[model samples]
Target: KVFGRCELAAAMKRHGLDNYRGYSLGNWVCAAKFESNFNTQATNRNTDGSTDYGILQINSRWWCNDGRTPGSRNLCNIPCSALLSSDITASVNCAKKIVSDGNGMNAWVAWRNRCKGTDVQAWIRGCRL
Candidate 1:
């Protein structure tokens, strides 16, 4: 599922991502824009044989188990496939765990490069949330 900016904002807020770990909903939205363009099924393979999945691009090596990433911690205790679902509940939960584990939003390189310390409000502008 591809979500518009406002649509994704509403969903992220609904899932408790707003101000989560001190990162605003617009920050998440900005991260999603650069990470996956709000595409739920987005996936990217890393050079280390791991993969990123879902809109938030949770990784396989440290988060979800993809049965392929060697030495996977599976901290989220969920299959990597779960992150690709349109429901986004699993993805949101895993993302929360990532932040709670002290990684914060820096777990996503896209967020660090594109969303961090920027005018993130532009990402959620006009979203009547």
Candidate 2:
């Protein structure tokens, strides 16, 4: 529920997350834009019965525990609700684990379907970083 593209970029830069699994910062920015319009509180229920949490739309099936989704791995050991907050440090850290875990941003359908192969430079346009 906070920050726009530029702010997100600055935060990402400050967090030392300019790249991941061979993906650029623009990829993350574009993915977050399409997935949640940059809203940290964004949540969507998938037809597969798994709920996506936060701007990155992390699946509750593995990344986090909502205390409701069954068969969850809770690899991040974080509450799904924590992903909904404006303070994105936890979510970013978990997402790093996700990328390193071998899934990468492809774990989010939005990134695959919309951000893939697209020029995402606009996502960081005008950012001071």
Candidate 3:
């Protein structure tokens, strides 16, 4: 997870997100550090059999909360968490899902609005695009 954060930060720089929203990047890392503590194996509480996944903090049942998929990974299957059982990207993707659901915006954009690129929250009122 530490590597992911540093690498993602570097990726942000490479992708010019750092240039556009430097403060948001830092804010994202800061929150991620505290929430997951840079630990990939991070887990937490839920219903009796609900599934929650990795550093992204995705809930298995939430993703497939509906009873359409079928089996253990059915309504409470937690697809991403299941992938997290063997893949790291799945977890990251899961986190990305959570971030984007509000509107496909990353954590950087989330924080940048009130804390990053501009000192004033009013300035970063642009769409992610």
Candidate 4:
């Protein structure tokens, strides 16, 4: 499922992304916009042989177990496939874990490069939440 801007913002907010770890809902929305364009099934293979999965692009190397990435930690303890689902529950949960582990939003290069230190408010500008 490819979500519109506000739709993605609303969904992330509904899943407790608002002010999660001191990061605003717009910050999460901004990361999702650049990471996957709100596409639930998005995937990107990194040069190191790890693959990023789902809307937030949780990586297989350290988060999910894809059985492909070398030395995968699978810290989220979820199959990588779970992140690709439209439900987004697993993806959101995993993302929370990533942030809680002190990685912050910088875990995602897209967020670091595009959303970090910027006015993420625009990402949810038209959203009711």
Candidate 5:
């Protein structure tokens, strides 16, 4: 698994998100908490390697697309598997760009709204800029 139980936080923070903390962080934490219980080693064999295994829950198949060509299906320019071979910075930087997308962190706001819901709005108030 990439980060295990991070489905969102790890995905968001794996790049460069640290200002949003506590309940806001908890909102993201809740996603993984419910999904994988924040377990770094959590492996969902339910889908086998066909999908990804990590905190951000990236699919190995999609992430594999990045390393080879531009515009590949890499999760964020950084292949999930690459984490094992090289520095974690690459993965984080890539994730940051993916979330940033030549823009600012609005992508994260979008993601939060998409992943979370009216109930999840609690964290939205605590969201950082």
Candidate 6:
């Protein structure tokens, strides 16, 4: 959350999230930018009654269990609160699984709505990664 873009990128790379599973680092960077602005505490309650969490805005409906939603799938088997930490390890791992399951970063609305087809390198500028 306190990370500047470069610092966040470094951490992402160190976590093995950069270029993970055919996902370019720039894709992750752009999704992080729009989804949470790199803020780990970011949470948004979607109109569909799902909650999004952390820098990646992973959803409660599938990924994490916040204990607030009934019949939650919790596919990622993680506590939603855990994803809110500045440490991004759990979040990145979960994201990799999500992306691997389907249309890659298209799992994130931010990627489809804000990042795709744009100049995504801006998210990695000056990151030196």
TM-score of each: 0.96, 0.92, 0.47, 0.96, 0.42, 0.93
lDDT of 3 by residue, 9-102 (tens): 5543444443242235555444444445556667665556654445445555555332332343332334454533434455444544555556
lDDT of 5 by residue, 11-121 (tens): 555545544423245445544454444444443432333544343343444454424343436555454555333234544454344444543333333345444553654
Give the per-residue lDDT of model 2 (tens digit) for 1-129: 767898898887777679766778898899888889999988999776779988788888888998888887899999899999888888898889988876677777888999888888878878888
Q: In candidate 3, residue 17 scores what lDDT?
A: 41
List the candidates ranked by lDDT, beginning with the highest.
4, 1, 6, 2, 3, 5
User: Worst ten-residue run, lDDT, model 5?
Assistant: 102-111
- Give candidate 6 misplaced runs (Cα > 4 Å): none
Worst 10 residues of 4 by lDDT: 120-129
Tens-digit lDDT track of model 4 for 1-129 = 998999888888889999999999989988998999899999999999999999999989899999888788999999999999989899999999999987798898999999999999988886787
Worst 10 residues of 3 by lDDT: 120-129
**Residue 47 shift from truth in candidate 1, angstroms:** 0.5
Q: Model 5: runs farther than 4 Å from truth?
A: 1-15, 18-24, 45-49, 64-72, 75-115, 118-129
| Local error of candidate 4 at residue 128 (angstroms) | 1.4
Worst 10 residues of 2 by lDDT: 12-21
* lDDT per residue as tens, model 1, 39-107: 999999999999999998988989999999887889999999999998989999888888888778887
Model 6 residue pairs with clashes: none
Residue 12, model 6: lDDT of 86
For candidate 6, the per-residue lDDT at 104 reads 76
Candidate 1 stretches greater than 4 Å from native: none
Model 1 scores a C-alpha lDDT of 0.90
Q: Which candidate ranks first by lDDT, i.e. highest?
A: 4
What does the lDDT read for residue 56 in candidate 4? Answer: 94
